[PDB]
Amino acid sequence: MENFQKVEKIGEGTYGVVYKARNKLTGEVVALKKIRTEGVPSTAIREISLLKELNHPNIVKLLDVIHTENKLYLVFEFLHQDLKKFMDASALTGIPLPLIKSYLFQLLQGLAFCHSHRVLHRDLKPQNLLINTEGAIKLADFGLARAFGVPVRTYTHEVVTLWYRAPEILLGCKYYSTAVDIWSLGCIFAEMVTRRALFPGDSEIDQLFRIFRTLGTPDEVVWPGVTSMPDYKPSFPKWARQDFSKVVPPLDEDGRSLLSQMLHYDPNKRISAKAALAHPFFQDVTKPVPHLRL
Numbered sequence: 409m410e411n412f413q414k415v416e417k418i419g420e421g422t423y424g425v426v427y428k429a430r431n432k433l434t435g436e437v438v439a440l441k442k443i444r445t446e447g448v449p450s451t452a453i454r455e456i457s458l459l460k461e462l463n464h465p466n467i468v469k470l471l472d473v474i475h476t477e478n479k480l481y482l483v484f485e486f487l488h489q490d491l492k493k494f495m496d497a498s499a500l501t502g503i504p505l506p507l508i509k510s511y512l513f514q515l516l517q518g519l520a521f522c523h524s525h526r527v528l529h530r531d532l533k534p535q536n537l538l539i540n541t542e543g544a545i546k547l548a549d550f551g552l553a554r555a556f557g558v559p560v561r562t563y564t565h566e567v568v569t570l571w572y573r574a575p576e577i578l579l580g581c582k583y584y585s586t587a588v589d590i591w592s593l594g595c596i597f598a599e600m601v602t603r604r605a606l607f608p609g610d611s612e613i614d615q616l617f618r619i620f621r622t623l624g625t626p627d628e629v630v631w632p633g634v635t636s637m638p639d640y641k642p643s644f645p646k647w648a649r650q651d652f653s654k655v656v657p658p659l660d661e662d663g664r665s666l667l668s669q670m671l672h673y674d675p676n677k678r679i680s681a682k683a684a685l686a687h688p689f690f691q692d693v694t695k696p697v698p699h700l701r702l
């Protein structure tokens with residue numbers, strides 16, 4: 409890109425490298441993402457372009473879609489730190505509960521907004537949750553997966569994380585629903601509380617079995633239709649569900665209750681973002697400022 413000035417290489421995005429850049433005509437700093445190649449689907453540019461229309465305090469604004477020199481670029485508002493880094497920085501003391509609650513509440517608002525606009529994320533993870541000094545947290549990359557197509561591996565041959573993947577996706581369901589995002593957010597909520605990833609699988613089957621070992625191997629009783637999912641196998645080991653109090657100590661009953669509703673196996677039974685916002689866990693929610701080291 410010329411219309412920009414690459415300050416640094418922020419990191420590795422799901423679809424390509426992410427750069428911290430400066431708009432040459434405005435002097436503004438943004439998050440520039442180069443999308444990894446046979447012409448660029450015209451369907452994608454149209455889909456993605458509609459996203460520039462989404463506007464919410466908890467959604468990282470897609471400023472522009474730039475298609476020039478037969479290369480694709482997405483220009484996003486720049487935020488100063490991601491939740492992965494903040495969690496790592498908060499590892500010794502943990503994120504204070506009131507801030508964890510504020511972040512969860514805000515993320516649910518961003519989800520509620522996108523879902524009401526018929527937009528799913530499908531690949532929520534600590535790396536695409538961005539925070540600022542003011543106490544806000546925003547979701548980036550909403551609607552990209554559907555417009556594009558989650559590739560097995562990036563062109564950088566970097567490992568894609570499966571830790572936040574809903575069980576229905578792992579079982580090979582090719583139809584997504586808003587519930588996949590609630591699942592990912594539930595996993596993130598648990599990780600903020602315990603300071604350890606909930607289901608750190610290193611493979612698709614390891615990821616599935618780690619979920620099974622904690623929540624019990626699903627059956628037709630708790631998840632009608634599961635034995636007919638594409639990758640379900642009658643040979644899956646049968647693990648008993650573990651007492652949920654052992655899962656996220658020392659989160660209180662309201663928090664554990666909300667989390668269990670975000671982690672129901674049946675997508676249809678999983679709580680909606682809108683309903684979650686009404687949960688008693690948020691009765692005393694506030695908006696604390698985080699201690700960010702930039």
Ligand SMILES: C=CCNc1nc(N)c(C(=O)c2ccc(Cl)s2)s1
Nearest residue numbers: 439484485486487488489535536548
């Ligand atoms: C050190 C400050 C970095 N600032 C950033 N700002 C934005 N907007 C970022 C992203 O959208 C993503 C980057 C990677 C994924 Cl995955 S989403 S990173």
